[PDB]
Amino acid sequence: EPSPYVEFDRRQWRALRMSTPLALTEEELVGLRGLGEQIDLLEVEEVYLPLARLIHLQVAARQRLFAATAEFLGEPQQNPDRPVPFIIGVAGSVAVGKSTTARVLQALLARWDHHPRVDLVTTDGFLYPNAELQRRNLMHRKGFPESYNRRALMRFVTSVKSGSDYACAPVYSHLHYDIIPGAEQVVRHPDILILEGLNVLQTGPTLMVSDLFDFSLYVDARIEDIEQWYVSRFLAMRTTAFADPESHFHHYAAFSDSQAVVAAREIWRTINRPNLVENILPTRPRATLVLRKDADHSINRLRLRKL
């Protein structure tokens, strides 16, 4: 029986790297690396370089596609110094490490001949404010589709891709657990915009941000390991983030491995776990590429959508 997907294991995938140049320092990789992640330059070579190569084979191609419609509409040929922005979506659960994947991926595409203007945006700033969430009773549902201003989010990506000179996005504070007043992230006609989020790949009764993606990644892993990674790093933050007297969750810092584990499992169970199962996982089937990680965070298997 035929399939739209083709699957590899690093052995295979790492080959397609061809001769793609590794433009990343190990100290540079570390500044993109997040607490918990095991990513090293090897993986960046055997996994991110082929991805980088792949993506570039399509940025030019996906171009000959807007051209076609331009040529159809009887329109000039926009400045090759400003074509249509390439949209990439990175999706996956909390703690799966999609955020590092996105940061790394940006660093790569960024330092790639030309001088590509690769921008990265997380759907975080598109969360309604704690006060707005309280009004809607969603304070315990952050991460769920309805806790985001998907209306605003669409205008953003739509704007950018439709060739605008600048689009603004709100900013979220993880320390203060809320959207920052006045904060603005301005994105000016990138060449490639990477949108990172949980349900970014979701679909609905209306054109959504995923309908604008030209390529998408879905970092994956057994729901059982993610919980581990989630909990494990809840504890780990007792001495990093929660340590700041300014943190909203500074109270978690004094917890014990035990108390913390209870706390962590409960949040996972009541929030992130459900959200992953009923919202994020059902989008996995339509991601250009899935990055399957082993319990050790190692990406040892991939799934590409050929169709």
Added chain:
Amino acid sequence: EPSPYVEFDRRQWRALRMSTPLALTEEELVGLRGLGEQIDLLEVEEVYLPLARLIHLQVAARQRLFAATAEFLGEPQQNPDRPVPFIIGVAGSVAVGKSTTARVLQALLARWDHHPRVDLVTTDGFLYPNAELQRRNLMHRKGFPESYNRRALMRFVTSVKSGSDYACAPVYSHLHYDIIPGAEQVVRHPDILILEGLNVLQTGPTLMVSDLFDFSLYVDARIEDIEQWYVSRFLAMRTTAFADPESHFHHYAAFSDSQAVVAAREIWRTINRPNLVENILPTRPRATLVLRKDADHSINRLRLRKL
């Protein structure tokens, strides 16, 4: 505020026709034309020719896209005498005339230089059998997503597009109101396959037939007119189809304009009307092109997805 769509009126749309050749006879157009439809060669010129032109600007482009992945995967360059099939979906309510739109569209792309092998398939044969529908209690829900073997339907389009030499599809009898035993529609590596159906554009928790479309059309109209067109042609069939003593609905032939109108409105109200409102219309937002028809069946407005 920017939009993914650009809208035209025939005046504008008909221009993009450029110099596309009209290879259709009025007698030929008539054999594609269905009871109720007002389509004439003019419309075929001012509306279908630009569409034909547009589509061809992308068939070649959407190609440079599978190529990219082929070049990435380190694969040869398949016979240019068998590339990847172009998939087009035509969607819309019952009686809107999407079926003629699909037939016409095939005739055009068919007679277009080269010798394109343009195949047309309706999701009809993918309906479970009356006996299977009875088992699931769906005999009064034909047309609804769950009255179709979408599993089988996907394997079909997936198969074809993944470069198979032949895929088989069941056949539906409108006269006998059921799937025909043993009937087979064999489609052999087309160049362009057109899939016509109601929810073909629908989306779900799994990769669907719409995720394989390279271009899609959605024939549209006010829900109030469609009802008119629906009813109006229920009556009209009393003397055409229902006239056959072999028809399942031969009983409708003797009805009176009145009885028939009641019968028609009831079916519309209890079946097609709901289905259109809760299933077909919510897919309209993501069709490459929408064909908006006026109460006179005239397509006097269009909406193209540029993004």
